[PDB]
Amino acid sequence: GLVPRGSHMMSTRPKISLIVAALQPSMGIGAKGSLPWRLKNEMKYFKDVTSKAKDGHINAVVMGRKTWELIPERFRPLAGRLNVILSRKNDDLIDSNGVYHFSSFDSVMKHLEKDSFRFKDMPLDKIFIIGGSQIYNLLILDSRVDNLLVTQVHFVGEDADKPQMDTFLDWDLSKWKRLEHDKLEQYVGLDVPRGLNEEGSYNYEYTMWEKA
Numbered sequence: 001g002l003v004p005r006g007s008h009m010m011s012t013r014p015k016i017s018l019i020v021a022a023l024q025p026s027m028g029i030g031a032k033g034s035l036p037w038r039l040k041n042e043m044k045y046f047k048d049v050t051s052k053a054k055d056g057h058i059n060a061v062v063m064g065r066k067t068w069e070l071i072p073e074r075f076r077p078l079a080g081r082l083n084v085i086l087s088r089k090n091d092d093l094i095d096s097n098g099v100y101h102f103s104s105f106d107s108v109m110k111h112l113e114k115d116s117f118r119f120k121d122m123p124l125d126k127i128f129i130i131g132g133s134q135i136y137n138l139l140i141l142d143s144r145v146d147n148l149l150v151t152q153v154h155f156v157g158e159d160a161d162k163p164q165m166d167t168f169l170d171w172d173l174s175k176w177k178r179l180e181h182d183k184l185e186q187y188v189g190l191d192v193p194r195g196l197n198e199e200g201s202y203n204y205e206y207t208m209w210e211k212a
């Protein structure tokens with residue numbers, strides 16, 4: 001935080017991550033309004049990563065309206081995190097549980113900046129964009145996104161049984177560069193398994209990318 005020297009701001013400005021699982025090779029991120037894989041350890045990774053903040057800080061999760069509707073009521077808002085829901089019909093309100101119902105990523109970022117990136121008298125550490133496909137494909141083009149946390153998902157059943165995806169991440173690889181595993185662990189603040197994790201007909205690898 002602040003020091004007697006007067007040289008440091010109270011907190012660093014929060015990094016923005018887009019966290020997503022994408023099917024190889026064509027970056028499929030949805031099928032028929034859902035997702036064809038259900039990976040228990042990957043869902044735990046999402047919980048652990050989005051919840052892990054440096055001491056005295058909290059993280060934010062930013063999601064589209066349709067994804068908010070698919071979180072079970074008893075688990076909303078996602079505990080231990082600033083929840084932001086995007087809908088163009090929202091009225092830019094912060095409700096009785098501290099949930100931000102905002103009309104655009106621009107509007108919520110403007111508000112957070114006005115508040116010195118603080119919430120419930122906690123500074124923000126990381127802001128995670130958590131989906132769904134429409135919000136991912138809008139915000140992956142936003143210059144404020146600092147990194148991608150991509151779970152690379154591989155189908156390892158028979159070729160004919162691979163799920164047919166119908167929504168894909170608008171990810172231009174020329175704009176991004178994969179980092180080594182130590183950088184991923186240092187960013188997320190956790191010990192993360194390296195390599196291909198196995199569950200059923202899928203394997204999956206945790207990766208991090210920054211801008212080229």
Ligand SMILES: NC(=O)C1=CN([C@@H]2O[C@H](COP(=O)(O)OP(=O)(O)OC[C@H]3O[C@@H](n4cnc5c(N)ncnc54)[C@H](OP(=O)(O)O)[C@@H]3O)[C@@H](O)[C@H]2O)C=CC1
Pocket residue numbers: 019020021022028029030031032033034035063064065066067068086087088089103104105130131132133134135136138
């Ligand atoms: N691969 C992965 O890791 C993940 C994939 N998914 C997949 O995502 C899919 C669902 O995603 P989707 O249906 O696209 O729903 P989203 O969660 O992306 O929410 C879509 C809604 O966001 C609002 N919206 C759209 N553009 C804007 C904007 N510019 N500013 C503000 N609000 C906006 C709209 O509601 P309004 O009209 O009210 O503005 C729209 O209906 C499912 O297939 C799910 O499995 C979800 C999570 C993780």
